[PDB]
Amino acid sequence: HHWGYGKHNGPEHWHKDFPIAKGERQSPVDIDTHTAKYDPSLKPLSVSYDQATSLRILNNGHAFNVEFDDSQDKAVLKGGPLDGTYRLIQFHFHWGSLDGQGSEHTVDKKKYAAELHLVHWNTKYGDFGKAVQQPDGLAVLGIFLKVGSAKPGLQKVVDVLDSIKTKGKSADFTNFDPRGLLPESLDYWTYPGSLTTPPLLECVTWIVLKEPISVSSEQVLKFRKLNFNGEGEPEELMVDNWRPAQPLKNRQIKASFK
Numbered sequence: 001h002h003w004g005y006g007k008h009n010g011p012e013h014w015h016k017d018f019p020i021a022k023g024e025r026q027s028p029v030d031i032d033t034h035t036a037k038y039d040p041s042l043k044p045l046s047v048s049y050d051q052a053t054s055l056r057i058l059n060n061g062h063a064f065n066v067e068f069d070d071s072q073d074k075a076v077l078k079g080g081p082l083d084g085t086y087r088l089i090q091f092h093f094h095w096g097s098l099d100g101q102g103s104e105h106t107v108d109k110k111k112y113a114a115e116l117h118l119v120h121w122n123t124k125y126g127d128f129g130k131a132v133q134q135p136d137g138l139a140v141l142g143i144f145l146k147v148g149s150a151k152p153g154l155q156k157v158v159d160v161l162d163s164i165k166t167k168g169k170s171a172d173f174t175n176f177d178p179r180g181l182l183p184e185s186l187d188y189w190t191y192p193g194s195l196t197t198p199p200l201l202e203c204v205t206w207i208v209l210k211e212p213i214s215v216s217s218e219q220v221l222k223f224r225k226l227n228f229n230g231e232g233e234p235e236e237l238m239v240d241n242w243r244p245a246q247p248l249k250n251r252q253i254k255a256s257f258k
């Protein structure tokens with residue numbers, strides 16, 4: 001039936017309905033640090049989230065999305081390997097049932113507790129829908145999460161998940177600053193790829209930060225309290241909604257640092 005994250009509808013079944021699952025630039029992938037090469041030509045990465053305008057948090061049945069208002073240049077990603085401007089439309093996470101797994105991209109095979117993804121779409125294409133029909137239409141900033149000390153700027157998100165336990169629910173989540181989710185350093189690895197959930201469109205330029213942020217056990221815990229099911233249905237906790245690393249094939253990962 002509908003794609004999910006189980007023994008019967010998980011990643012290993014996605015290709016049947018979504019053939020591109022075995023494509024040439026699928027994500028995520030394992031980042032081999034001793035093979036990625038520093039690129040002296042990458043321009044400084046620019047992440048301008050000052051005028052960000054969050055509007056709503058939504059449980060879509062496989063994760064929760066904090067949607068932003070992108071009808072104007074408010075929150076934009078640029079610089080790095082990107083040409084032009086990319087607008088922040090939404091950010092979501094991928095986590096595990098255990099701190100030992102959860103992230104999608106892996107560093108030298110190491111799996112993080114979770115992984116944050118801020119999705120932006122190339123403004124040169126007018127809108128998200130049109131952007132997802134281009135080789136360079138999207139730009140996703142990936143940030144790893146590791147369990148330890150709590151992340152202040154992430155608590156609003158934590159406290160609100162209670163109101164959106166089940167699939168379909170969506171609470172007003174206005175005025176959330178995504179800057180509180182950015183690690184200190186901006187060093188990153190970048191490669192051409194796709195979205196990690198069906199339709200798995202290969203339209204993404206991945207910008208994966210090396211420095212992970214650390215959240216508390218109590219925080220990630222509440223992420224694990226969510227449900228994949230809809231209200232009034234057998235409870236399936238929302239855990240392990242991450243896709244495993246896919247073949248790198250004929251791609252190269254460039255490091256923004258030496």
Ligand SMILES: N[C@H](Cc1c[nH]c[nH+]1)C(=O)O
Nearest residue numbers: 060062065195197198199
């Ligand atoms: N999860 C995708 C839709 C999505 C895109 N970005 C986040 N969610 C699907 O149901 O096919």
Ligand SMILES: [Hg+2]
Nearest residue numbers: 134135202203
């Ligand atoms: Hg594409």
Ligand SMILES: [Zn+2]
Nearest residue numbers: 093094117196
């Ligand atoms: Zn994602």
